[PDB]
RNA sequence: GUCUCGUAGAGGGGGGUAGAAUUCCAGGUGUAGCGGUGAAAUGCGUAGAGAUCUGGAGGAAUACCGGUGGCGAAGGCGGCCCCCUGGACGAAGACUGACGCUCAGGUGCGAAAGCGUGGGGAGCAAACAGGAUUAGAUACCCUGGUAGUCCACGCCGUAAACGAUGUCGACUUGGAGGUUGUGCCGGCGUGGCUUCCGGAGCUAACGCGUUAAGUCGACCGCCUGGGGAGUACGGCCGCA
RNA sequence: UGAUUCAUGACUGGGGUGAAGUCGUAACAAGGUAACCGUAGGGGAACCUGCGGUUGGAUC
């Protein structure tokens, strides 16, 4: 119920889903939406469109906070890397900064075995 | 990839820049390469194949500037 | 492993003069010095197999030089193994 | 000879994210590319240079 | 008698101890017939990344020629001194006296 | 060293000895000896209160200095010795003022080594300091639990304690059990590990070797009659009940710690 | 073959340390999903997950550099720092004077898996369990997961351990590169190792082609139709 | 009292040949999960799975 105006949007863009979480500048979450909970399952959930719908719903969940400015942190290789950012600017927020925070091990742990499909 | 949108810079211009800084970092190719484990014999096999292809293709290109098609 | 000073000392003690680095006695004494010096390294590093290959080459190189000296001048051979403390 | 202290020169051979730039792009000789990589890795340990840009 | 290059970084809150630490160390090299080829005080610099949550540190660079034994002792001093947050000892081919690129 | 016996008789075939050529071969230091007669596991009501204890070899008690509070005076190790009373070896040390004492022998300690205790002692195996003055991450043994009380933790052969953190008046320790335990930082500890780590590699080899150590046979409860033990009874080998102690308490997982007074010091139980 | 001076190198053994990431633990914010697939379900989540922030614990591996690049007898070797240590190469000389080449038997080294004892265990994952797919599915796919992978010491002695090409030496047109020395005045030479093409010649052909599968010499190993069979029996070795 | 050799033995191990009945479809094309080597575990069977290795893999 306290105003913030300066938040941070975190985009978790995996191959199967997109999670959008808006926090303040200290990491405290204010609201979230996901492509899977916006009415899409299966092959529809892992699309750029479903990611866009999630970005809108997240913008609505935090409209009480009076957020005006956003930094954007994108994480992952999924199809919702760009449509979520496009929708966050179309939602009225002023996109101040865009950053990739995808984790990269500097070697790290052995990955799972290759799939034989 | 840290794109600071500067003043008066429209959003689309910043969006195309961030995309450029990502591709120039190879983050997407690096993530896709780390999704599953590649046996060291497999890594060596495909490093050699890419070098044989880079070479044998250039050597045919030289033989295609010294020949007429019609 | 042998330093320059230690090497030069051996050349003077077993050679004809200061730059007789090639005589059989000098070579055998030089190999003997490195073999003995490396015994302390391999007492601590028993699994240093790669270095030990170099040591075993010194041992076989010394054996061949000794067998040559013994075939040429037995007297020089007897003196040499006595000064160095070798069984044969 | 390359110096891990000579930070101004080293910055020419690292990307914006901090990665060492390939010698095929900077046109560096192979023998000196190996000295650059060693120097850059020492500077990173001394915190004269970053490991990754998200610092 | 080999040539070494020593860099150590001091907790900024103990900056007032650096001139004392410097004298104590070189006294240990000199007292063992070792020489000091170069000694620079870089002061507080911004760290490229945080160390122990810090963001700055006081750098010192020396170049000495000492026996391995006193250098082994110097490194024991660094490890157990809480003010020294990071150090680095390197062999050098020859003595280095010219001014470093920091100064 | 760990030495297998040759099978010249059935009682020798499986014996494995721990042979240490550095232990003193003569008699112990007499001014630090006391008599210590045996109990058979019986208390002052004359009742057996711990089963399976009796007999074994006569043993003299060696007075061991667990407090290590002779500060500022160096001591030199004179010899290592066998101590029948414990798994660790002990070391006879001579202080500069001419006093001799026994200490637990740390790993690596040998005759001629120098040791010291106090706030200003060097960080070396065998030296004793308040844990306030010992670097976090160090390996220590013979750790006090209350300042001045004397060492009580990590005294057995090959054991040690890790100082994992230091917060205010307390340090956090990882014990051999796996427990994480808080102890006052003013409590002392000795650097290094208790020696004689090969102790656990010995193999007794025969029944009599346990009898030499004062251990009497264990009779299984299922081999008894019902009047003797909850497990007793049966025509043939029968069981059919949840395993319990001779006094009826479950003995395969039921926890028995109940000390609310010291709960505040256990950061994390061993499991 | 020895000595002198220097050069490059993931060559080996020992110790220390750094940053990224995964997992786990604690706490803050926050709320209905997460995860997974071809689609699902098992699984996880209102007992507050997933997401996000802070702190801690621990193990393993070292992004970029990085390269038909380098080193090593082969197997193999990749962050940084120190300590111990092997080999190779070059330039000028000096020294020894055939001291050489090959090698049955013998001895040593020898990936991964596996075995023994003691540790360690994040991630991965034989076996195993469940969910799917299917006519079935003791699989491929999904969710989990134990040996094992890691460390110390010992054993085992095998791999398409391959260039499917034994070691050493001499000789015989060329072209373009890589890498590492060195001489001379970017230019001209001269050494080492290495990649691709191709001439004569060779080859059943494919191809090889100065790093030969060309032309010769020295010594060793090995083959003699397919199956039975690298099996049986015996010996030796091994804890198996 | 041993050694060696020949004959024979309830039962049992795998092998060859014939014939084709039953069960599947492992390999040959990318053989529909690239194949194969060593090793280990599992499975009515061909085999499957892990770890390292090879190209004597198609596509790119
Ligand atoms: K004892
Ligand atoms: K019993
Ligand atoms: K019973
Ligand atoms: K009974
Ligand atoms: K009975
Ligand atoms: K070296
Ligand atoms: K042989
Ligand atoms: K798994
Ligand atoms: K089917
Ligand atoms: K496991
Ligand atoms: K084996
Ligand atoms: K090969
Ligand atoms: K060259
Ligand atoms: K040249
Ligand atoms: K041969
Ligand atoms: K076994
Ligand atoms: K018979
Ligand atoms: K198959
Ligand atoms: K195939
Ligand atoms: K297999
Ligand atoms: K069956
Ligand atoms: Mg997966
Ligand atoms: Mg030599
Ligand atoms: Mg008992
Ligand atoms: Mg007792
Ligand atoms: Mg018992
Ligand atoms: Mg009875
Ligand atoms: Mg009863
Ligand atoms: Mg019965
Ligand atoms: Mg029954
Ligand atoms: Mg293994
Ligand atoms: Mg087994
Ligand atoms: Mg094992
Ligand atoms: Mg084990
Ligand atoms: Mg699985
Ligand atoms: Mg074979
Ligand atoms: Mg190989
Ligand atoms: Mg190969
Ligand atoms: Mg072969
Ligand atoms: Mg050719
Ligand atoms: Mg032929
Ligand atoms: Mg056989
Ligand atoms: Mg064997
Ligand atoms: Mg098939
Ligand atoms: Mg197939
Ligand atoms: Mg076989
Ligand atoms: Mg299976
Ligand atoms: Mg599988």
Extents of the domains making up chain C: 1-88
Q: Where are the alpha helices (DSSP H) in F148-216?
A: 207-211
Q: How far is B25 from chain D (nearest CA, A)?
A: 8
The verdict on a CB contact (< 8 Å) between B37 and A114 is yes
In the complex, which subunits touch F with 3 or more CB pairs below 8 angstroms? none
Confirm if E34 and E65 have CB atoms less than 8 A apart.
Answer: yes
CB within 8 Å of F202: residues ≥ 6 apart:
F2, F16, F17, F18
**Are the beta carbons of F203 and F196 closer than 8 angstroms?**
no
Proximity of residue B37 CB to strand H below 7 A: yes
Q: Which of residues 85-104 of A touch strand H (CB under 7 A)?
A: none
Which nucleotide is closest, CA of B52 to its C1'? G68
Report the alpha-carbon distance of residue F175 to residue F156 in Å, rounded.
12
Half-sphere exposure at residue A20, Cβ-oriented, CA atoms within 13 angstroms:
34
Structure-token pair, residue F186: 């003013």
The answer to whether F182 touches F171, Cβ cutoff 8 Å, is: yes
Restricting to B residues 1-20, those with a Cβ less than 8 Å away from any Cβ of D are 1-2
Residue with tokens 């029948």: F84
H/E run at residue F172: strand F170-174
| Sign of the four-CA dihedral F91, F96, F97, F98 | positive
Using a CB-CB distance cutoff of 8 angstroms, which residues of chain A are in contact with residue B5? 95-98
Residue A98 with chain D: CB contacts under 8 Å: none
Residue B15 inside a domain? The answer is yes
Q: What residue has token string 């020492």?
A: D42
Q: How far is the CA of B45 from the centre of ligand 18 (A)?
A: 21
N- to C-terminal Cα separation, chain D? 29
Q: With contacts defined as CB-CB under 8 Å, which chain D residues touch B25? A: 15, 17
Query: Does the nearest atom of strand H lie within 7 Å of B36's Cβ?
Result: no
User: What is the span of the domain harbouring residue B27?
Assistant: 1-56
CB of A113 lies under 7 Å from some atom of strand H: yes
Using N-to-C axis directions, what is the helix angle for E18-30 and E68-80, rounded to 10°?
160
- Token pair, residue E60, equals 């010192």
Question: From the Cβ of B57, is strand H under 7 Å away?
Answer: no
**Upper half-sphere CA count for residue F156 (Cβ side, 13 Å):** 7
Domain residue spans in chain F?
A: 1-113, 117-194, 195-271
For residue A92, is it left (φ>0), alpha (ψ between -120 and 50) or beta? left
β strands within chain B, DSSP E: 2-4
Domain F1-113 falls under CATH 1.10.10.10: no
- CA-CA distance, A83 to A11, in Å (whole number)? 11
- Number of C-beta neighbours around residue E102 at 10 A: 15
Instruction: Give the integer Cα–Cα distance in Å for A54 and A36.
Output: 8
E35-46: strand order across its sheet? E35-46, E56-66, E2-10, E84-92
> Are residues E3 and E66 in contact, defined by beta-carbon separation less than 8 angstroms?
no
* DSSP 3-state percent helix, strand, coil across chain E (nearest 5): 30, 40, 30
Way it was determined:
cryo-EM
Cβ–Cβ under 8 Å, residues F161 and F137:
no
Sign of CA dihedral E48, E50, E56, E57: negative
Spatial CA neighbour of F89 closest among F41, F37, F22, F33: F22
Cβ under 8 Å to E: D residues 1-55: 3, 5-8, 42, 44-51, 55
CATH annotation of F195-271: 4.10.950.10
- F228 contacts: CB under 8 Å, gap ≥ 6: F221
A96 in Cβ contact with A69 (< 8 Å): yes
User: CB of A98 within 8 A of CB of B15?
Assistant: yes
Resolution in A: 1.5
Cβ–Cβ under 8 Å, residues F172 and F162: no
Pick the closest to residue F137 from F186, F188, F172 (CA basis).
F172
In a domain, B21, yes or no: yes
- Read off φ and ψ for residue F223, nearest 5 degrees: -90, 5
Domain membership flag for residue B64? no
Which three-class secondary structure state does DSSP give residue A56?
helix
Among candidate residues F17, F13, F12, F15, the one with its CA nearest the CA of residue F1: F17
Contact state of A106 with D51 under an 8 Å Cβ cutoff: yes
CA D23 to each of CA B50, B52, D12, D26: distance values in angstroms, whole numbers, following the listed order: 19, 21, 12, 5
Contact F201, F211 (CB under 8 A): no
Q: Which of E49, E61, E100 is closest, CB to CB, to D47?
A: E49
Nearest in space to E26 (alpha carbons), one of E8, E44, E45: E8
How much distance in Å is there from the Cα of F4 to the middle of ligand 32? Answer: 25
Residue A99: closest C-alpha in chain D: D54
Q: Does A99 contact D54 at a Cβ distance shorter than 8 Å?
A: yes
Helix axes C74-84, C49-72, angle to 10 degrees: 140
Q: Which residues pair with E67 in a beta bridge?
A: none
CB atoms within 10 A of CB F260: 6
Contacts of B21 in chain D (CB under 8 A): 16
Q: Which of E47, E61, E102 sits opposite D47 (nearest CB)?
A: E47
């Amino acid at each position: 119920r306290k105003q913030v105006s300066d938040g941070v949007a975190h985009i978790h863009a995996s191959f199967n889903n997109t999670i959008v979480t808006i926090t303040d500048r200290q990491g405290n979450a204010l609201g979230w939406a996901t492509a899977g909970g916006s009415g899409f399952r299966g092959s529809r959930k892992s699309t750029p469109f479903a990611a866009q719908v999630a970005a809108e719903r997240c913008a609505d969940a935090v409209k009480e906070y009076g957020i005006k400015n956003l930094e954007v942190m994108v994480k992952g290789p999924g199809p919702g890397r760009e449509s979520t950012i496009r929708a966050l600017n179309a939602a009225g927020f002023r996109i101040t900064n865009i950053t990739d925070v995808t984790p990269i091990p500097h070697x790290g742990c052995r990955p799972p075995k290759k799939r034989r499909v | 990839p840290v794109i600071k949108v500067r003043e008066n810079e429209p959003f689309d211009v910043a969006l195309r820049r961030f995309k450029r800084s990502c591709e120039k970092a190879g983050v997407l190719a690096e993530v896709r390469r780390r999704e599953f484990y590649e046996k060291p014999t497999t890594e060596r096999k495909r490093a050699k194949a890419s070098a044989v292809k880079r070479h044998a293709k250039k050597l045919a290109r030289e033989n295609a500037r010294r020949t007429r098609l019609y | 492993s042998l330093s320059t000073e230690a090497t030069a000392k051996i050349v003077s003690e077993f050679g004809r003069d200061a730059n007789d680095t090639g005589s059989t006695e000098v070579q055998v004494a030089l190999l003997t010095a490195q073999i003995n010096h490396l015994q302390g390294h391999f007492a601590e590093h028993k699994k240093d197999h790669h270095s030990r290959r170099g040591l075993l080459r010194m041992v076989s190189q010394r054996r061949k030089l000794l067998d040559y000296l013994k075939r040429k001048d037995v007297a020089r051979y007897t003196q040499l193994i006595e000064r160095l403390g070798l069984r044969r | 000879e390359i110096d891990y202290k000579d930070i101004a020169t080293l910055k020419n051979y690292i990307t914006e994210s901090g990665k060492i730039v390939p010698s095929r792009i900077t046109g560096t000789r192979a023998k000196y590319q190996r000295q650059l990589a060693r120097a850059i890795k020492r500077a990173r340990y001394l915190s004269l240079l970053p490991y990754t840009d998200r610092h | 008698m080999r040539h070494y290059e020593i860099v150590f970084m001091v907790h900024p809150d103990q900056s007032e101890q650096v001139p004392g630490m410097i004298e104590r160390y070189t006294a240990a090299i000199t007292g063992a017939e070792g020489k000091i080829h170069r000694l620079e005080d870089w002061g507080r610099r911004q760290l490229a990344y945080p160390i122990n949550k810090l963001h700055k540190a006081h750098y010192v660079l020396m170049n000495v020629e000492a026996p391995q034994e006193v250098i082994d002792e110097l490194e024991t001093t660094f490890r157990f001194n809480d003010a020294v947050i990071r150090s680095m000892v390197m062999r050098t081919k020859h003595a280095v006296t010219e001014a470093s690129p920091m100064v | 060293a760990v030495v297998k016996c040759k099978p010249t008789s059935p009682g020798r075939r499986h014996v494995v000895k721990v042979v240490n050529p550095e232990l003193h071969k003569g008699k112990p230091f007499a001014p630090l000896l006391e008599k210590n007669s045996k109990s058979g596991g019986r208390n002052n009501n004359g009742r057996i209160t711990t089963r399976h204890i009796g007999g074994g070899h006569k043993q003299a008690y060696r007075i061991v200095d667990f407090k290590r509070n002779k500060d500022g005076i160096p001591a030199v190790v004179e010899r290592l010795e066998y101590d029948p009373n414990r798994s660790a070896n002990i070391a006879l040390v001579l202080y500069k003022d001419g006093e001799r004492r026994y200490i637990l022998a740390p790993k690596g300690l040998k005759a001629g080594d120098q040791i010291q205790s106090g706030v200003d002692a060097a960080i070396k195996p065998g030296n004793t300091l308040p844990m306030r003055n010992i670097p976090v991450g160090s390996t220590v043994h013979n750790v006090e639990m209350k300042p001045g009380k004397g060492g009580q933790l990590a005294r057995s052969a090959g054991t040690y304690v890790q100082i994992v953190a230091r917060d205010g008046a307390y340090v956090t320790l990882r014990l051999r059990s796996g427990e994480m335990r808080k102890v006052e930082a003013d409590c002392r500890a000795t650097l290094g590990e208790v020696g004689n780590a090969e102790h656990m590699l010995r193999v007794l080899g025969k029944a009599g070797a346990a009898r030499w150590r004062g251990v009497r046979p264990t009779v299984r409860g299922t081999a008894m009659n019902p009047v003797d033990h909850p497990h007793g009874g049966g025509e043939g080998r029968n069981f059919g009940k949840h395993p319990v102690t001779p006094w009826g308490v479950q003995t395969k997982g039921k926890k028995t710690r109940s000390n609310k007074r010291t709960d505040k010091f256990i950061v994390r139980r061993r499991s």
